[PDB]
């Protein structure tokens, strides 16, 4: 539902009409295809909530 934005050191999702950054996760994003097709894609980490829970 958001936009990807950066402050120059980090990347966040935020909503369009009011700045409120949140960490990028598997749950505020959706997947489609591999990196090769998209014009202007960038590398960053995406957080996964499941594994660090099931680790403990």
């Amino acid at each position: 539902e958001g936009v990807f934005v950066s402050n120059g050191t980090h990347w966040f999702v935020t909503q369009r009409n009011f700045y409120e950054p949140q960490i990028i996760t598997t749950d505020n994003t959706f997947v489609s295809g591999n990196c090769d097709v998209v014009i202007g894609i960038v590398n960053n980490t995406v957080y996964d909530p499941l594994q660090p829970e099931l680790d403990s």
Binding site: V3, R16, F30, S32, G33, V37, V38, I39, G40
Partner: protein, 49 residues
């Protein structure tokens, strides 16, 4: 508010109920269809006044 044009079209796609990845995965084809459709309008105006 400035915004990149390809990202603006991806939100205008999202407004018609088509998932925004459909634009970024087809951006060249979508641009050629747009550019050619503007081209046809010059010919239409130059022929059927």
């Amino acid at each position: 508010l400035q915004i990149p044009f390809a990202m603006q079209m991806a939100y205008r796609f999202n407004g018609i109920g088509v998932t925004q990845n459909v634009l970024y995965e087809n951006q060249k084809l979508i641009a050629n269809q747009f550019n050619s459709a503007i081209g046809k309008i010059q010919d239409s105006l130059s022929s059927t006044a």
